[PDB]
């Protein structure tokens, strides 16, 4: 299991996490979710938010009383571990109508490469 | 003002008014004013009482002989006329010691966006 692959996803988490306050501020001020396909007040264009392994970081999502805004990092399509190429890592705002805002992490990459708090759970059924 | 601004404030009035019976029933049965920061018996959570233009409707206030319970509608922070964004419209219970419940309307919006019954009065001194 590649620890190099794990670190690449860690970069995506860090870059996505860097937008949490800016996105939460807009949600709390305006009750809306900012979208940065182009630069928008206070947030750079998604493709201008990048790293060594991350192509873009896109804010979006659908607003609900509980939150709903998303920050999605998309991995580069080369010079990245093959199972991560083009994959995404998503932070989603929640809890906004109950208590302190939360940011849940999910991803379409395999759990083996993800931080524990970003992994899905698989169970048997009856 | 515009028909749209009127419709927006009117939604607040309508949503707040939909809680009058429930609030007044609790004041009369329990003796205290219900608070719906969380859902409470008879009343939804404030943020679950919403509309096209209205973000939440909160019951509260301090009991007095004549009532005193409040129903406060908060306007959304977007998709509403700019001067109404985030403003509140308050209905306050009165006359409870005398007869039929009355509900006086106040607001923290500019008077020009409010119907006469909800407006403040300014005079020289």
Swiss-Prot record, chain A:
It is a single-pass membrane protein. Signal peptide: none annotated. GO terms for molecular function: glycosphingolipid binding. One of its GO terms (cellular component) is membrane. GO terms for biological process: biological process involved in interaction with host; cell adhesion; type IV pilus-dependent motility. Disulfide bonds join 33-69, 105-118. It is found in: Fimbrium; Membrane. Its main location: other. Keywords: Disulfide bond, Fimbrium, Membrane, Methylation, Transmembrane, Transmembrane helix. Belongs to the N-Me-Phe pilin family. The pili are polar flexible filaments of about 5.4 nanometers diameter and 2.5 micrometers average length; they consist of only a single polypeptide chain arranged in a helical configuration of five subunits per turn in the assembled pilus. This is Fimbrial protein. The lineage of its organism: Bacteria, Pseudomonadati, Pseudomonadota, Gammaproteobacteria, Pseudomonadales. The gene is pilA.
